[model samples]
Target: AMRIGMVCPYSFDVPGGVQSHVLQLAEVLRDAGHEVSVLAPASPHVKLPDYVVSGGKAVPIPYNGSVARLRFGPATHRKVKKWIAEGDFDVLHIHEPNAPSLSMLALQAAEGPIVATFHTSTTKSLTLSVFQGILRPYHEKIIGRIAVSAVEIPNGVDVASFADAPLLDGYPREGRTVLFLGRYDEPRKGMAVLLAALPKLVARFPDVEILIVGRGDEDELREQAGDLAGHLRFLGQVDDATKASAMRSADVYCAPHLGGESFGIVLVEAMAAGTAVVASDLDAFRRVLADGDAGRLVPVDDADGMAAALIGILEDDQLRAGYVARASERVHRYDWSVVSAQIMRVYETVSGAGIKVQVS
Candidate 1:
């Protein structure tokens, strides 16, 4: 096998889509017997795996109460240089190279064979376009995917894990259960729409329960829920198996994201688990749902539509069955087995051409 180096800008300890993407990508590569090393910003709180190399120290951000070590000073560059020299990787995969973090640092330090994943894209602003202009020369040199490499690859999920999962124990499965996953503190991820729709859903089905599976402000969310507060579980950050199990048992896996969903890997996972999806009608989300054939697509911020759709899915066993069947067949495209092999091809392609050869 080949030696590969990967760079992630976010804190490896923190829970995020890109971090998880990088983690899973590295993991699948390692499982396939590639010699893989990941360089990432880390926190003192979470222990890293053997393959991860800490590139920067966790420093507190004062203005916001949030903490992730997004530091890049001389020491960070020095450490990266050392890693690059010592790693001697056949190909370097840097994630979100445009971000102000270790990925950018790693991209700057490495001169050859780099693959980048531009994980997020939205309406481009003028200053951001300027930033893109500045990054182009470096980005142009790389030939694989942008989160800067030119080739595109979607994020992967552990398909077998979700596909064969058992229903979560102790969760309310008697009624029509729906799952809301991911960190719910931000409005961009769209808990507000779900909350708004809950009133109508509660009125429709008295036994209906919403299993909230990630961290959020309990007080504020309950306030938003009004009288229907008891209808939610607020399970608050479950482990992966539990997460899978919850998806497995739920009637619908609701993805009400307002925007900024890069790859919608969770949507794929919900599909794999045979949970019908109801997501905002973003092109990104729609494509993941196989152009609305695989899941129900509601307009963004449409509580009435979401409520009606949830009612339709919950009330009709036939439609839910059709969706799950379609999803199960369709989700094979995203399995680690298929996607990893695809990624491996890219690695092999770049490894030979992009490595620096001595001129001596």
Candidate 2:
């Protein structure tokens, strides 16, 4: 069994995409019979098991508005450097590509084969021109980078955790519900664009309801939706089961995220639920959607276009079924087992471990 060390920027106190991905990666790797350890800056509220702290209190990152408290106490690098020098680990997998924890891990623990997953989008113009400009120096530290979905990366959906069940009847569509689920940072999610298209889509099919999930900026969104809120049901952030229920209950999933996203977990989740999807037409999106066969694609920031595509997919039952079937077949590649295996290969490649490293 390989001994793996995972380094990330945050602890469980602030669970976001990166944190969720890191947790899943750790659990999957451990379940594969490998020894796993998480090395990160500790939060005052959330504790880490088998962890190391350099010295100071946790420092928060100003960008995401989440907890950023981290310890820089003592020689953080020196501590990790010594740990790596001892050679107990087979590989070092760094998540959050940025952040001080990863930076220190890379610099001090340079002995192991290091794999860095590029979990965010590199092409977000607004963010590039602003908050991330400071990250230019650290980008080079990554030995290897992974984009979560081709549909979401520079190029896509294989994991269909959300598609396993459908709530078609409950959604009042008599078939499938048109879905737009995820965080409610409306502009970031491009919810306004989705809302803008609601009138037209509703005009065409009065029975269709857009299920918007997650919580954030609801007041602004409610105002933006105006009279359309009657047809739009906001479930806020939900448990996996509730989310799955939402996915199963819907006919079509919509992801109109304009920017501020590095990956599209919800898109793949919808595909997992076996629902046809309508997504944005970004480079990352194209890769995730696999060129539209899994579902439909529309231009970024175009609500009217999104509505048109959503309408088109929902109008024909046969077309929707075809997309859903294809997605179900394709999602197997994204199974935790499969994703972890690919990661193991990267570990072997980086650590120069033998072809048959004998994973536990």
Candidate 3:
């Protein structure tokens, strides 16, 4: 069995995309008979599995309209160096390796083969540009580079878990429902835009319910909902099972992100749950939706357009059914069974196998 060390820059205990990605990917690798160890920061109050090594405390910083909890220090650097030397990992996979955190520190300290996966896609960031100059040497040390997109490896999903999950209780099943999942407080998540669009949707499907999932200020969402507050149901942050149930229970899943979404992991989950999708016309979302073939795509932050697209799906059963069929089929391609194999090949390549493993 290969000893693999996976490093994440974000706090493993938190519910971030990179953290979730690392945990799920490590699980996939571990189940495949390989030894996988994850290193990351953890909150003092957060409980973590024994397999995860906490390097230091995660300090929260405002970034991309969201909060990023990252750990970086001379002490943490010493810890990472010691871990790499003692662990003797055949291949160290680091997520967001360019970011100024533990991953970059790992790059600086690693003596063995290393693979870096880039997760976020942003047009421009002052922080990224500033860090770019200082991080160039470490970035170049990455022997293998992978991305989550059509160009490289895609994000994996637990298909059976979502497909087989039962619908959640206390959520309305009487009338058609539109579900939105993301941090409402994050402007990039577009909760305010979604709330603005709800009035138009309410007029058409008077019985339709809007289920807003994820952690956010309830008062802010309510205030944004305006006169249509009664129609909006805030489910807050839910567990994975409840999230899957919400996806399956809803007739339409809407993602009205304003910008800065790299990969639509939630979109993949929604597709796997066999729910019709209506997302913002961002390139990443478009890629996940197959250029509008699998779902409806509306302009970013366009309330009227979002409302229209959602209404189209809710009103037309034929259209909605088509989206569900296409999305469900397309989503299986991103299952862990398929994605893990591709990742394993990358590990092999960086480990000096020189084998050209085909990736679809």
Which predicted model would earn the best lDDT? Answer: 3
Q: Give the best candidate by TM-score.
A: 1
Look at candidate 2 and tell me the lDDT of residue 355.
Answer: 25
Candidate 2 wrong stretches, greater than 4 Å = 11-15, 41-87, 99-106, 121-160, 163-176, 352-360
* Cα-based lDDT for every prediction: 0.78, 0.64, 0.79
lDDT of 3 at 332: 93
TM-score of 3: 0.89
Model 1 alpha-carbon drift over 4 Å, by segment:
58-70, 122-131, 146-149, 353-360
Which stretch of 10 consecutive residues in model 2 shows the poorest summed lDDT? 149-158
Give per-residue CA lDDT, model 3, range 222-265, as digits (tens): 77667778888877777777888998888889988888746889
Give the winner by TM-score: 1 or 3: 1
Q: lDDT tens string, model 2, 43-141? A: 556544444332223444456554344445456555555555543667776665444554444534463356666566443231232644655544444
Model 1, 1-360: lDDT tens per residue?
A: 788898888885657778888888888888878889999885556666788888877454556554343445567777888888888788888777654567766766677777767777631221244556676655555656643114556778898899888877765366789889978888888998988898889888889988888877888888877888899887777778888988988889999999874778889999989889999998789888888889999998898999999989999989989988899999998888887777887877777844641111
* 328: Cα error in model 2, Å: 1.9
